[PDB]
Amino acid sequence: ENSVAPSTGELALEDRASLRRVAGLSTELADVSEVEYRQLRLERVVLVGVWTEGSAADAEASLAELAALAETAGSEVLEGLIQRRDKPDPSTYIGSGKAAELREVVLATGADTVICDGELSPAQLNALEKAVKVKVIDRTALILDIFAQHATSREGKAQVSLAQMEYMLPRLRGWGESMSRQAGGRAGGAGGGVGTRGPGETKIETDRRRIRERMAKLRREIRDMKKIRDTQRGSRRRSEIPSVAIVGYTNAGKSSLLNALTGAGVLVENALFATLEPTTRRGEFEDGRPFVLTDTVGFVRHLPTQLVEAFRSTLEEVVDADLLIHVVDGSDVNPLAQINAVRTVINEVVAEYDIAPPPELLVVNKIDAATGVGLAQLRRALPDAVFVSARTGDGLDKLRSRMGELVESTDATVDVTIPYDRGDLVARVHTDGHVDATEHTDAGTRIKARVPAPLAATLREYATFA
RNA sequence: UCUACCCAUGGCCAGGGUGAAGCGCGGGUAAGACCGCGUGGAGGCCCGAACCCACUUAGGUUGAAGACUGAGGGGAUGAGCUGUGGGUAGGGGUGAAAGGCCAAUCAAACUCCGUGAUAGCUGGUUCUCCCCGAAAUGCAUUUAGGUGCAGCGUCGCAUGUUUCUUGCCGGAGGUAGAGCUACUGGAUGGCCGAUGGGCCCCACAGGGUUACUGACGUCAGCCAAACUCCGAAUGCCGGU
RNA sequence: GUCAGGUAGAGAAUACUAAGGCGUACGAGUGAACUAUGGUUAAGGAACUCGGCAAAAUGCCCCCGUAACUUCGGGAGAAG
RNA sequence: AAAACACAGGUCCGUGCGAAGUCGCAAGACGAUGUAUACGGACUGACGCCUGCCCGGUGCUGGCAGUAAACGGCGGUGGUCAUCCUAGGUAGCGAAAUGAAUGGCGUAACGACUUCUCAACUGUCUCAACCAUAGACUCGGCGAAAUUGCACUACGAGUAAAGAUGCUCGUUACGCGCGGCAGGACGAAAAGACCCCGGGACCUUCACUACAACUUGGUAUUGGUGCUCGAUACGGUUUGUGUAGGAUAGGUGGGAGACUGUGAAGCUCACACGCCAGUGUGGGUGGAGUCGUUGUUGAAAUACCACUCUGAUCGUAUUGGGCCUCUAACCUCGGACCGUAUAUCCGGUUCAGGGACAGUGCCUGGUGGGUAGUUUAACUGGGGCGGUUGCCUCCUAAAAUGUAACGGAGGCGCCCAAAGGUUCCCUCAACCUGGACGGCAAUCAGGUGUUGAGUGUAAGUGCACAAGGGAGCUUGACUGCGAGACGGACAUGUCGAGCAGGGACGAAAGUCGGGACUAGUGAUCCGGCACCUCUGAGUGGAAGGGGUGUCGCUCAACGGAUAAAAGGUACCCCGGGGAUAACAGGCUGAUCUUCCCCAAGAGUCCAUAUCGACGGGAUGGUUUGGCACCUCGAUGUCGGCUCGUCGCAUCCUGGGGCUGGAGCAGGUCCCAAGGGUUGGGCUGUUCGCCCAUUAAAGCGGCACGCG
Numbered sequence A: 001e002n003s004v005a006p007s008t009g010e011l012a013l014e015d016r017a018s019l020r021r022v023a024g025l026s027t028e029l030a031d032v033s034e035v036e037y038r039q040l041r042l043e044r045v046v047l048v049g050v051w052t053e054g055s056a057a058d059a060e061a062s063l064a065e066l067a068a069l070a071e072t073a074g075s076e077v078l079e080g081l082i083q084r085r086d087k088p089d090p091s092t093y094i095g096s097g098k099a100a101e102l103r104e105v106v107l108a109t110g111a112d113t114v115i116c117d118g119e120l121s122p123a124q125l126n127a128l129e130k131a132v133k134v135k136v137i138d139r140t141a142l143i144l145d146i147f148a149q150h151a152t153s154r155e156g157k158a159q160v161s162l163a164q165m166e167y168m169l170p171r172l173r174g175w176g177e178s179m180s181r182q183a184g185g186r187a188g189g190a191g192g193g194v195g196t197r198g199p200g201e202t203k204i205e206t207d208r209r210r211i212r213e214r215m216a217k218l219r220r221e222i223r224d225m226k227k228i229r230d231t232q233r234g235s236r237r238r239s240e241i242p243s244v245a246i247v248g249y250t251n252a253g254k255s256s257l258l259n260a261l262t263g264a265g266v267l268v269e270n271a272l273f274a275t276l277e278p279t280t281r282r283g284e285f286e287d288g289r290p291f292v293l294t295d296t297v298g299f300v301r302h303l304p305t306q307l308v309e310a311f312r313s314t315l316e317e318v319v320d321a322d323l324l325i326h327v328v329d330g331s332d333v334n335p336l337a338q339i340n341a342v343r344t345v346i347n348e349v350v351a352e353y354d355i356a357p358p359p360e361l362l363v364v365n366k367i368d369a370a371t372g373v374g375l376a377q378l379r380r381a382l383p384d385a386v387f388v389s390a391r392t393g394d395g396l397d398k399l400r401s402r403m404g405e406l407v408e409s410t411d412a413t414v415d416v417t418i419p420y421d422r423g424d425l426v427a428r429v430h431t432d433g434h435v436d437a438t439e440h441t442d443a444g445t446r447i448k449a450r451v452p453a454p455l456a457a458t459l460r461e462y463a464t465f466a
Numbered sequence B: 001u002c003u004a005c006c007c008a009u010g011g012c013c014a015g016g017g018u019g020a021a022g023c024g025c026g027g028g029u030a031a032g033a034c035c036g037c038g039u040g041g042a043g044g045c046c047c048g049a050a051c052c053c054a055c056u057u058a059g060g061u062u063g064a065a066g067a068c069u070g071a072g073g074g075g076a077u078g079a080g081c082u083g084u085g086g087g088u089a090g091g092g093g094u095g096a097a098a099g100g101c102c103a104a105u106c107a108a109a110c111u112c113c114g115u116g117a118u119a120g121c122u123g124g125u126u127c128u129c130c131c132c133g134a135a136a137u138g139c140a141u142u143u144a145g146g147u148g149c150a151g152c153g154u155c156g157c158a159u160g161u162u163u164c165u166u167g168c169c170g171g172a173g174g175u176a177g178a179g180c181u182a183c184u185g186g187a188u189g190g191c192c193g194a195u196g197g198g199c200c201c202c203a204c205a206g207g208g209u210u211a212c213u214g215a216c217g218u219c220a221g222c223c224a225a226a227c228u229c230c231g232a233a234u235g236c237c238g239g240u
Numbered sequence C: 001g002u003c004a005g006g007u008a009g010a011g012a013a014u015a016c017u018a019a020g021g022c023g024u025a026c027g028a029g030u031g032a033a034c035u036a037u038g039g040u041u042a043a044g045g046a047a048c049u050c051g052g053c054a055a056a057a058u059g060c061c062c063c064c065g066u067a068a069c070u071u072c073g074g075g076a077g078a079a080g
Numbered sequence D: 001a002a003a004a005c006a007c008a009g010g011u012c013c014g015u016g017c018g019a020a021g022u023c024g025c026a027a028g029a030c031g032a033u034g035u036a037u038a039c040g041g042a043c044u045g046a047c048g049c050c051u052g053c054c055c056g057g058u059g060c061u062g063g064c065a066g067u068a069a070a071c072g073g074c075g076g077u078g079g080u081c082a083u084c085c086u087a088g089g090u091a092g093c094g095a096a097a098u099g100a101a102u103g104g105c106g107u108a109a110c111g112a113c114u115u116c117u118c119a120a121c122u123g124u125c126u127c128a129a130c131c132a133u134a135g136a137c138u139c140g141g142c143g144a145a146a147u148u149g150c151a152c153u154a155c156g157a158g159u160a161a162a163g164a165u166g167c168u169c170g171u172u173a174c175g176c177g178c179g180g181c182a183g184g185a186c187g188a189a190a191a192g193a194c195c196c197c198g199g200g201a202c203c204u205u206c207a208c209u210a211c212a213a214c215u216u217g218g219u220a221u222u223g224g225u226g227c228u229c230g231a232u233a234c235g236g237u238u239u240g241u242g243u244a245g246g247a248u249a250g251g252u253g254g255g256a257g258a259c260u261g262u263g264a265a266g267c268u269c270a271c272a273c274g275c276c277a278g279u280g281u282g283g284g285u286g287g288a289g290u291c292g293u294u295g296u297u298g299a300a301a302u303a304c305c306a307c308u309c310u311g312a313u314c315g316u317a318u319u320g321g322g323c324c325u326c327u328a329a330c331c332u333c334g335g336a337c338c339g340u341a342u343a344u345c346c347g348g349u350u351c352a353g354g355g356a357c358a359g360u361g362c363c364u365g366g367u368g369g370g371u372a373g374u375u376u377a378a379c380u381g382g383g384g385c386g387g388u389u390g391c392c393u394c395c396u397a398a399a400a401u402g403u404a405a406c407g408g409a410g411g412c413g414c415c416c417a418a419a420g421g422u423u424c425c426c427u428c429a430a431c432c433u434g435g436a437c438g439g440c441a442a443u444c445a446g447g448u449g450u451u452g453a454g455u456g457u458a459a460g461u462g463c464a465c466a467a468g469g470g471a472g473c474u475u476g477a478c479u480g481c482g483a484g485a486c487g488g489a490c491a492u493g494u495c496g497a498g499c500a501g502g503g504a505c506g507a508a509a510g511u512c513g514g515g516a517c518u519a520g521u522g523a524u525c526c527g528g529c530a531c532c533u534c535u536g537a538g539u540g541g542a543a544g545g546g547g548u549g550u551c552g553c554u555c556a557a558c559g560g561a562u563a564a565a566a567g568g569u570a571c572c573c574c575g576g577g578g579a580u581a582a583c584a585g586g587c588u589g590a591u592c593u594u595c596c597c598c599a600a601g602a603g604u605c606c607a608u609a610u611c612g613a614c615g616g617g618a619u620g621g622u623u624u625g626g627c628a629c630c631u632c633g634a635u636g637u638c639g640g641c642u643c644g645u646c647g648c649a650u651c652c653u654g655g656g657g658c659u660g661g662a663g664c665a666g667g668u669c670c671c672a673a674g675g676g677u678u679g680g681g682c683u684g685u686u687c688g689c690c691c692a693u694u695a696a697a698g699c700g701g702c703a704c705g706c707g
């Protein structure tokens, strides 16, 4: 450019941001012992994203999410290139100044792997590939691959496959044929719910006709596994046991809490989304009533829009709850970015299924290893919260106390006396009603029990006034 | 003589509306523009018969008809329709251009001639009995549904068991099988245990001795079209 | 190509008729279904359907009254 | 019948006048009885809007001045080519009714155009009924046609060239008619238009080869004058370095005479040469002999020549090219007369213009789809796209040879003057030991080391006896041959003992006609080059031919159609094919569909109320497929309508078990096919979405039933 729209000194329209090959942390790197063959850790993925929003500090966690995605998905990151583009690029994504830079960046990797962050229309992916000719899958395809490798239940192996088909259907030509040509089991290779390839050799399939047919069958099957789930939850619904759910960002001790308060024993792997199918377990409020506890799947910033069906059961558990719990990973940078996304998910849930929002119990987790990011009322960034340490079980008592006190009691506290002949009633109050205490009176007892509705009218006749 | 276009010379277009220029009276206006009122009758104007077309629908669809009928439809003073007489002719004509039309036919008319065109393609090829009796393979092919040569039939002449079967004898294999501690590779479980780690007491030595891992071997149990230390049965080549 | 009666009518349209010319060359029956061409229809009124295709509707004369827009001519027989 | 063509309007290009353009071989014609405000061709298509930074000079019309992105540049930058003022239909201006500001927006009126909505109306429909006429039907008369192997021509389930009136086993059926329906006779009709193969046709082009047309030149018509550059012929003293030197000498053969007193040698000077070798020309007091083979230089003498040529460029004869003209050939559709009463024809005479130009002939190059004749491969699990095509090596290949696939892996189109021949000698790879660099690791020593290294090059077969590693000498990487065989359609391809001649190496025996072996290549024709004793169109020669050796092809589609060749056809046509595709049928069941088996787990505890991973086994024949068996001398497609009929894998209704069945209501499984299973708006929908109901708004087969 000699005199074309005078912009000398930039060639990228931005004084500071322009072409931003920061390589600040260089994402992250690995170490020895990944040296058996070349496919145990091969996709030395380079990352790229657009700073199109506020502080690059709050966007650093955004690319940390992608780095963690790659780490849990297997293949280890090798480089990261975050562009300070003012606004998202309309047709391409890289910046058109890095359209050549990308190749000389990726000559430093180990195997062909470049990853974008935002969801890319096929318009992007038609030339973003031609930029380097190396397979590029965005963050949504990475989430779909993670779930594909983590799917284990029949329901999940259909929801994940449907989500992948619904994501790949728009971007069939070009990109779709690109991973059709590339059949080695890459990061985009996914696998569907099989995980151990199977349809992984077909990846996300290629044919639009075949995709459409399998999509119709999967729609029908997911329809069936909702009138299965309603049956399975009927027993809880009919008994109206007080339900408590645990939501929040992934890796925030969401399953460790449910293995901590109650001795459930669910998988607690360190990687990202692993408890991909909701599981619920019984529990007793320390003082009185019993309850049920449910741990959900896991939320992410800018959640993929093809995974709402895979999250549908999670949403159902969220709606059918009394005390919602968003667990925040205390020992992590910016412990609020997770919170805003989780909350936003909550609003879209309460909107899609119109219901009175339930109280949201707040717990900060991993404060045992935290360096006190606030170390004050600053650490009380949300002043209402309980600082539990699931790795050590510190706030369990305080949590177990306040969670019940914040669930509300639908009991009926009465004072009743029972002549000894009808010890059946004494036993029924002592095993169903959660009696506080009493003194063992001459003929009866001064029982002060938070008796329920079935026995409320039972004990009305044998009442007392003292 | 149909149709396309052109030339010469003739004819036809019921009826009913609208109302251009111009002109006049004027006004209007400084005057002009213009505005009113009259006359006037223009227009590839309007509605609509004859006429010329052919938009829709139904019928016909071995028709009444090798392109029509019924009902509606478009133009109908015009780049109009039409009579009579002419002109342009085939790689040519004409074409408000459709590969349209040029005598019921047009991505090159018809007729006769070259001419009995040619067709690796299709069809057809007419009486009897007797004797023998296939092939659908190889090679080559502007070749793959054709053909050339070889193989297999038959007839004749020459030779005469040379053919074939069985027994015996002499042969070369690397198949079936099996084996791998005999090569090249895969691979299971131990034992031996280098080294690397092991890193602490604390030396930096030496020790403990590594969740360890692990050279090197070693034992056991396996695998292979393109592995063979091995290795048949049949078949094949000679002799008898 | 020539002629173009009468009444109704603007009309060479249409209907009925004068002059004149014809009954046009297979007939006779018969309430079959069905097909064609006509006719009518309760109550709804395009629900039919690819699609108001087809049919139905409007239609004449005289008085009034006539929109957006406009190339100032028209629209316009507006509509009513 | 239109959105296509045309159109008025516009823009560009060409044309100065029997014009350009077109028809004709030409003459001639139209253009036009016109004349740049006109005519021809090409694009666009009323009308409007969008839209130049402002005039110096590459230059232009020329008289300085236009001009606009006439050419830049939008740059300062007015401004709005106006003062000054810069060699991209362009981001000028970068201005969203909408990349077009020469291509996009608008646009009144108009349209048998396309797509929607409203009001009115209606048998279009709910959902039909009735009436008349013309057929149909009956009676009398006349009286066809396509079709046709047959015939006292059933149905089910099978079988069969895989869809049976004809076959098999059963079930049903008295003989002959009439009126109707349209499910079959793969009904009739048309030697399938789709698809493939072969032929053709017409079209296109930077396919090949030609031609027309245009055009560049040479020359003939075609001549004269001059200038004019010289391509021209014919002669010329002095000049001329080894020149031996009476001394810077062209010979030559005559050579002994010429120069002779107007002037010998010797000269002296101006000037050529200038290599002062010093010759000389010319000029000058100038003369009264130097001379010459004087043998002299191979050789004159500056004595001559007759030549030779050698001086060194002056005259000298014809001659090309250029320029200038001129008239006389030739040309004029410029005029005037005459034949000629008639005459824009034609010819003749004459004047006026051109004029050796043009036009035309023969020759010669260039452009040349304007036109023609033709080419444009085959294989192929249809064709196309993609790949391949010859040679070598493995596996397939079933222990001889051979053996296919669009089966599994690779290589080659060479390299080497030594990496060939011979003689002689040697042994590796790896391991251990210990030595400065030195390291697991360059070199050294010792020890193990029997083949695991190497072998130019792929792979295989081999080779430690070495074919592997060295050194010496050599060219057998020969000539004339080759008994006998291998492989073989043929053409090719191989091996070969041994003989003779001349060699190499080795003392000799003996080995040597390329390389451990198997790839490294191309027939024939045609034509080069060298040698030879062949032959030489009457003869002698030569030309040409012949023989021997050898050379020229990615003729790689590699047994090689021509030396030379790409496409389109939905405008297509013919000849064939179910040898081969699209629909349907048939086989398979990968895919699909419905279940089942084991039980990790989920389900508040809880494998099995409801679900069920990881794996396995099946049914069915509805999806997409795979195959290519029937049909290409025709088996008419999707959807909708009408009419159905059947299965159950049951949507509703009916009967049961379990339940995480308290009741109400559900979930799941079993039994159950009698009946029923709505009407609309959107969608090609094939699918589906939406609206209002319903007991419910089932899924499927029947050529995806039914033209």
Ligand SMILES: Nc1nc2c(ncn2[C@@H]2O[C@H](COP(=O)(O)OP(=O)(O)CP(=O)(O)O)[C@@H](O)[C@H]2O)c(=O)[nH]1
Binding pocket: A249, A250, A251, A252, A253, A254, A255, A256, A257, A267, A268, A269, A270, A271, A272, A273, A274, A275, A276, A296, A297, A298, A365, A366, A367, A368, A369, A388, A389, A390, A391, A392
């Ligand atoms: N140090 C520490 N680590 C914790 C604490 N709580 C949870 N973690 C860690 O978080 C990790 C993620 O395990 P998990 O409990 O599944 O977290 P999660 O949020 O449920 C991840 P998912 O959403 O996929 O189930 C575990 O490895 C666990 O060790 C804590 O209090 N301290």
